Design a protein around this ligand. Sequence first.
Ligand SMILES: COc1cccc(N2C(CN3CCOCC3)=Cc3cc(S(N)(=O)=O)sc3S2(=O)=O)c1
Ligand SMILES: [Hg+2]
Ligand SMILES: [Zn+2]
Length: 258
Amino acid sequence: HHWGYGKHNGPEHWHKDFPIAKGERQSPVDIDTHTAKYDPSLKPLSVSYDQATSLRILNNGHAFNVEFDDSQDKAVLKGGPLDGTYRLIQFHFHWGSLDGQGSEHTVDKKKYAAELHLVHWNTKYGDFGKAVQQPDGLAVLGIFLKVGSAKPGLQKVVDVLDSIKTKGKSADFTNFDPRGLLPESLDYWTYPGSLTTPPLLECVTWIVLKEPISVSSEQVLKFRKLNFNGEGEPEELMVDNWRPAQPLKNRQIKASFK
Ligand SMILES: COc1cccc(N2C(CN3CCOCC3)=Cc3cc(S(N)(=O)=O)sc3S2(=O)=O)c1
Ligand SMILES: [Hg+2]
Ligand SMILES: [Zn+2]
C-alpha cells in the first residue's frame, strides 16, 4: 500500500512511486564538517517567532506535526542563505527507536536522537502549494536533538502526545512558542535539498543548526509511544521515521562559521 518506514514500504521502496527519490538534490545528507565550506558571505539567520500562532498537533501516521497559522508573516525566517521571507507552517520530528539514531542529517556520520524540522515556505509564492513547485520554495530549519537534560520548551508538546497516539488524531495546540526549541547559537550549515519524505520534492534550502538542543530520555521516550497505525488497527510504534543519508552528488555544504 502507501509509503512508510517499514521493511516493505520504507525509504528503499520510495523510488517506485516517487522516482525523484533518486534525484540530484535529495535529503538528508551527511554533513562532512571538513569538506563544508565556510562562506563569509552568509548572513546570520533571522528567526522572528515572537508572533507565532500554533493551531494544533496531529499524528499523520508518519510523525506528529505542530501546525501554525501561516496566513500572515507571524513567524518567519529570513537572512542566512535565504532570499525573501519564509513563513513557518509546521514543525515535526524524526526520531529513532534508540537514542543513537533518529536524525535524518548526520554530522560526520554521527546520528542524533531526533531531528526537529521547522518547515517554512517562501512567501513570494503566495501559498505552500505553489512553494513546493519551486527550487527555493521551502526552507527547513533542522535542529538536532541530543539526549541529556530536559528542554522545558518541549514539555508542552510531550504532554499532549497522549491525545494524538494514533494516525488521524489531532488536538488543539495553541499558544505554543517555538522559540523554546531553539539552541543558543544560530550557526548553521546550508545546502540545497529536498523533503525527506515522499513526495521528496527538491524545493528545500536546508539550514541545519550546528548546535543541538538537549531533551531528556523521558521526553524522547514519549515520542516513541506514538503509533503509525490508526485506532482499531494493530499497534505499530512510531519510531525510526527517518530517511537515511542520500548522496551529496554535485552539491556543496556551506557553513556560516569556521
Ligand atoms: C501544508 O502542511 C503539511 C503537513 C504535513 C506535511 C507537509 N509536507 C509533506 C507532505 N506534503 C503534501 C503536500 O505537498 C508537499 C508535501 C512532507 C514533508 C517533509 C518535510 S521534511 N521532513 O523534509 O522537513 S516537510 C514536509 S511538508 O512539505 O511540510 C505539509
Ligand atoms: Hg520544488
Ligand atoms: Zn522532517
